[PDB]
């Protein structure tokens, strides 16, 4: 039983791990606490970069975008470069998928625009997806500082794999915009110690990882087997007994991956 | 449980698998017609260079062996080089690992001396390692197309596992020696799409390969999970109802490794 | 008469080409604008680590050192992984050469200490190496922005190929700490498609990287001939009269070591 | 100029060497000693290959020859496992180039027809491309033991690579059998060590070696640069004057292509 395996990963990185995998035509689904909530932290700025493509034409990926050191509040290595410059719409999206720039999705998440700074939008697409489970109600950093318990800012493995499959396999977006959401991810620098590093060579991997407190760990992905079939990944897991500072553990996520290979296998 | 997976690879390539992992300290040990006999093939090479290394000194390695055109008899892409020049036991052992070379194969046989080219010889070796299963017939290349049903020139991957386990993590050797033959089958060229294509990259993987006519492919490994935990993977495979012409599918190896990688992770 | 080809290669390029080979006992010196100047930008990480390891004890690569969200400033593959734990010495140095990571070269700066956050001390250390040309005004990521005329943060070929000469090749460094820079200049993950891609297979490569804005593409190399006689290529480049966001063209790289490869045979 | 290195070669690998490139479109030629008489060695089994395919229907590779032990006279890796079960037409061409086997091309010579065993109907094929100054008088393996100063069994660089240059780049066979030979020559196994291993990686390399007594080392190849241009290089050696048992140094040839690849980058 492979929900047995889960377990004795969970007992040995003293984590909460949950997997979903949806089920293809050929095998079967993959569930483990994948009804169960967990912290959207960088993940979700996969489903946002789809949100400004499929509100906005592709000429919007030219606008330019002026912005203050004050606004400068996560982890931005490309927006801390490009200050007095601005940066692109386009240049948005790239650095929030690929080096998973927090004021990169602030500024997105403000094109989305209304209220709290666009995270009302952003859950409104979500539901037209048909995702009525997950919800964003901060901005970054503060959406990765939840404490547990607290369903703000959370996903779940189930929801969250669904969505990405109607992105990057079902037609969510249109094959012209959808081209441009994975080829960021494909071109990801974040996680390579995670799905990435649990698959074989010979499988395609394109990902968004999340990293926050309480040792929360992210990362879904759509990887595909050396013949060509596709399959949704979602590995999510936090450690909150820990504390606050809990260190999180990528190897937890990587020997999950695992598993889940050799059962498609 | 995994058997069933096994059986449904059997008849997605239209072969039969063999599979053998010795059970290590933590984890129990995977079978699956672990003690039904398939051909050596080329796999005989590994033990075959351990035999050398233990009935000679060190220095025997710098011994010259002069050949002939005659003696090329199979693919040797290494011995052909050096008709004119020879090669010493330690390049011998070098080409019949990492090359796969038959003619060095074949001149090893006949420095181990005795009855039958030293065949005799090779299957006295593994006796005296506790192998009371395996045997070997002939030489380079009429081992690899023995008909089916026939005990010559066979093992089972329970008895090459054990002999590979004791060569390399167990003290059938002296450190000196057994350092020569892991660094060998290390720098292995020939199995890149078998058990190290079913295997994350973050795993260590050393292996000799075999292929033979009536579809056979085996592939016996020693792989290191990125902790540093060491197992034995033993992968055999042939054809034989196919007919004598019959192809090798070099996927089911690779496929069936990818789902011991998950069981172990 | 080899400057033929490589003002051939400017002019295909739109590119200024900068090479130098400091001469060996047998073969002369190569010379192609080795006295002009060209920007640091990523090179400076090869003495940097070089510094650190000669002013500190082989121990002091164990300190822990500590980091918030702010210092990731520039494009930081590992420092973005491990804010929450902190990294060592040790792992800055590796991140540093292997995936040229700026928060990891910014901090090591800082553990050289001293004015500016330790560029003056970087300079002072290049000064004892006999190098009175190359010099280090600012941090990550400034110094790749410099234009065009500016002598801030640049060196030139004829400079840091003899700075790259006495780390590896000259004992500049005791060897225990020498060996360490070697391995991490062995692995490095930037520079494949550059001096490596020049030079046939079976020539070892050790390289550190550069690129910036203007087109720049740098690559200080140290190269084994088959036979084992090692040669110091520094080749360097940019392209600062196509703009600010001049592509960098790594194939004038590839090409250009390919020209040295044919007079070093 | 670039013929110095040449003669550098020469004198300090103690050979003689001869060197060829037809000249492009965009490049001159690339000559020394290209007008000198070389010996054919094991290159004559790749126009030898094309003279079958020439002047016999598709349907002839079909054709099964059966031969006697008596029969394998030189270096056979192939031929001598199928001395019962026989060897189509096919098959003997790709043991001919891929392994330079010595009875496959003895066995394609007696297809060919003709007096001297088809020595003369092959000389004649090279006569209608245009090459007036090679020719073939023995079989394996005698035309390799020829003595320096004979003109029998002998070609030049430039004669050879212009006929690789009609049969590989040319139309000298129709696409339908083009493609045959440039796959045969591309999977080819015995010239990992000079041609291909002088020229860099990302650098397409197809050859058909040759090698022979007196130190005799030949390869011709046809080599593409990374951005598809193709060009033909005919290498061969000797070192007469160090007797019949003189052994041949394959890094000359190797040290040989890389000045050639110096010129071409
Ligand atoms: C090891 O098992 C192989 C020797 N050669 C084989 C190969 O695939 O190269 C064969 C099957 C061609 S063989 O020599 O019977
Ligand atoms: C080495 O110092 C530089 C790296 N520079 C660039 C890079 O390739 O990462 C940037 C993006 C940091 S830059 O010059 O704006
Ligand atoms: C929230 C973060 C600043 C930022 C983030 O997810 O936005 N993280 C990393 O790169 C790891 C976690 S984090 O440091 O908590
Ligand atoms: C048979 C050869 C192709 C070639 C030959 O005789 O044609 N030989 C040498 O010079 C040694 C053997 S060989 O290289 O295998």
Redesign the interface.
């Known amino acids: ?1 492979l929900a047995d ?1 889960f377990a004795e990963l969970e007992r040995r990185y003293d984590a909460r791990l949950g997997v979903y995998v949806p089920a293809t035509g050929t095998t079967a689904a993959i569930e483990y606490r994948a009804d169960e909530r967990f912290a959207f932290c960088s993940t979700f700025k996969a489903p946002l970069v789809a949100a400004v493509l499929h509100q906005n034409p592709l000429t919007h990926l030219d606008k330019l975008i002026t912005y203050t050191s004050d606004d ?1 509040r ?5 927006a ?2 490009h200050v007095q410059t601005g940066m692109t719409i386009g240049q948005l999206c790239d650095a929030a998928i690929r ?2 720039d927090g004021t990169a999705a602030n500024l997105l998440l403000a094109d989305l625009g209304g209220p709290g700074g666009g995270t009302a939008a952003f859950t409104g697409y979500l539901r037209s997806l048909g995702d009525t489970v997950s919800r964003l109600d901060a901005e970054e ?1 503060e959406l990765n500082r939840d404490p547990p318990g607290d369903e703000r800012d959370t996903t779940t493995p189930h929801a969250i794999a669904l969505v990405l499959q109607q992105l990057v396999l079902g037609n969510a977006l249109p094959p012209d915009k959808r081209a441009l959401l994975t080829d960021w991810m494909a071109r990801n ?2 996680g ?2 995670r799905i990435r ?6 499988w395609k991997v394109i990902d968004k990882t999340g ?1 926050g ?1 309480y040792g929360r760990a992210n990362d879904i992905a759509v990887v595909w087997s ?1 013949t060509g079939v596709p399959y949704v990944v979602a590995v999510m897991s936090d450690r909150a007994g820990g504390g606050y ?1 809990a ?2 553990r ?2 937890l996520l ?3 991956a ?6 498609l ?1």
Chains 1, 2, 3, 4 share one sequence.
């Open positions: 039983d395996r400068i996560s982890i931005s290595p490309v801390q470069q080096y998973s950093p620098t974040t390579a110690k590093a649990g698959f074989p060579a010979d990293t407190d050396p500072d260190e999180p990528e190897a990587a020997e999950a695992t598993c889940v290979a050799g059962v296998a």
